[model samples]
Target: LAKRIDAALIMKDGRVVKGSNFENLRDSGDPVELGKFYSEIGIDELSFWDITASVEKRKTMLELVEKVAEQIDIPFTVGGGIHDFETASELILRGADKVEINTAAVENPSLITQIAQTFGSQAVVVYIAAKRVDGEFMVFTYSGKKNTGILLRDWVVEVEKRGAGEIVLGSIDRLGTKSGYDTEMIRFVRPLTTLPIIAHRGAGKMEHFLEAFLAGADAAKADSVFHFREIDVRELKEYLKKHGVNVRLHH
Candidate 1:
């Protein structure tokens, strides 16, 4: 799809971290600096996911958002620890273009409607982490630590009904690995909703990203590759543009 390519930073404390299968995280870099660099390069958008907030039961770090927002002019999505309308709105008010909810939305689906109503549907993105167990896609929460036992199909249908603007279909099994994205699962959920789907997890190479767009994802999210210099957003955009994919490019 001719849409967005985003890099998501997994936040712990105040620094950016990278992990595999949602564990074994190590320091990557400063969020503020990385955000600025990506913005300057060519990433269409970026994401800040406070990975520890939910598991630790803390709130989204508004301080980090303000710092990045102050320096990086690109639109970014802030997620993790957004438990209510107040928390959701705080990030948006502080400079986040969108607020993504996961555990909170699963626990209180109505909260999705509340946020969408407050900031318009585009502002509410539901982040769903799913893993295949016994050949079925099962949803997980709390930073991909707990399996909610909810079928991926069921939750997505409900998410759309709750007024969410976009769906982030994250594959827990493939996260941080170079196995590529779960394109089959993306195809599975593609027909379930008209909402823009952002393919998350296992984006290892430039070809993986192109595969995602061809699999019906409106956008694709990656992190470790971008963090460790395995791939550059500008180079990836150049590659995609060569393949006849439409993506924003600056410089």
Candidate 2:
């Protein structure tokens, strides 16, 4: 209830795409256009991930970021292919409010401290793509294609120690399933770190968002529901407020 939960738009290549379990991606629409729409609709924040940048070993979608920045007045964060402070700095200069790191941070844990030192922790977000293996949650890297064999709880504590501002905890098992978030996972993780955690994946209905918050997530993210018009952002916020969740309403 501290602030309105954020919304996200994922871009692969130059277009917004949605996927399930980190595979079978399908085009949603233009990333720039969707970003502008979310901004106009009074979304609390916007997140853009160039889902392939890191895996491909290329630069982030800077051109896309510049174009989106020209339209949206709200805070926006950019991620993907950020290996060093220079690239993260460039993204911020190009108008990203913050930068997210995943594989790079996993490969070099110290990079988290380095980026935080250079840009301040507020500008750094550590994204954890997690999958349940043998009843234990394990961290996955490289867009959830490679397993890091790192226990989710242990890694989260390390991330917090490394100076990240927030954690985007995405569930690979629930990614695009739309059944709901893995609330059990949230309950398990909420006690491990004090950093704000943004629950991602498996958002299928209005109740899922509420469930996430009640389960200790600071924010919740959904893609297919918003992308496919199954839900409206403004209406979702209104519902959250009506159901006793404190949300910033657009006047």
Candidate 3:
């Protein structure tokens, strides 16, 4: 089992914030410090998304990317507002081991193939943000602010066909709810592709992480749970290991 536990830092105006953020940004931890601390504590990887870039029609904060990259020794992923090959190239140049494309991938599907071709399949990650509507999972773009009218199950197949290395699935309905992972969604996506699936939202406890793995997720990514220290990464790894789940404890 290629089980992995990772943390996500959603950056707004260069400050790291937690899940479903619309609150005032007050002392929302420094990016460099959080990246370094998560890496030191045995997180398998660190994910940083500039959640503000696309809405503002700007690029990902490369300055912050470099600052965080320099401090962390783990495999880092940079995402949000990346719409073109150049920005993806720039991120890779700055030290991102992988680049996640959410909104832009919806606008231009070939961008996935472009990056995968230039870099490698492992370097291109497709983040699908979707929610259940009338028993059908519908895809949403631009951080769930807009609907793309795309079927969630079908889009998963499309991205994999487009050469996306891995798919990071996040349910908009469960964002910040912390109820648990959308296990049904995971089960639906697991059989459609050979690429690994990373569940990226709705985690509130250690059991939620375990549930995701049992649901066929290769990796579980939590934002608030990790940001607020609800669960220690090392201890959580221990729990998963004790549960007979194989995981990468060495980071």
Root-mean-square deviation (CA) per prediction? 4.8, 4.9, 4.1
Best-fitting candidate, scored by TM-score: 3
The candidate that wins on lDDT is: 1
lDDT of 1 by residue, 147-249 (tens): 8999999999999999999999999888768979999999999999999999998888899998998899999988878777788778899999999888877
Distance from true position, residue 4, model 1, in Å?
Answer: 1.0
Regions of candidate 3 where Cα sits further than 4 Å from its true position = 18-28, 52-60
Q: Using lDDT as the measure, name the better of candidate 1 and candidate 2.
A: 1
Estimated TM-score for each candidate:
0.89, 0.88, 0.90
Q: Write model 2 residue lDDT over 1-251, tens digit each, in one string.
A: 46446777767777677532222233237777677666777677888877665554344477777887888898788886788878888788887888999999999999899888878888899999998999899999987899889999889999999999999999999975878888989999999999989999889888889899889998887666877767778888888889888878729
RMSD of 1: 4.8
- The lDDT for every candidate, in the order shown, is 0.85, 0.82, 0.84
| Comparison by lDDT, 1 against 3, better one | 1
Model 2: lDDT of residue 3:
43
lDDT, model 2, position 43: 77
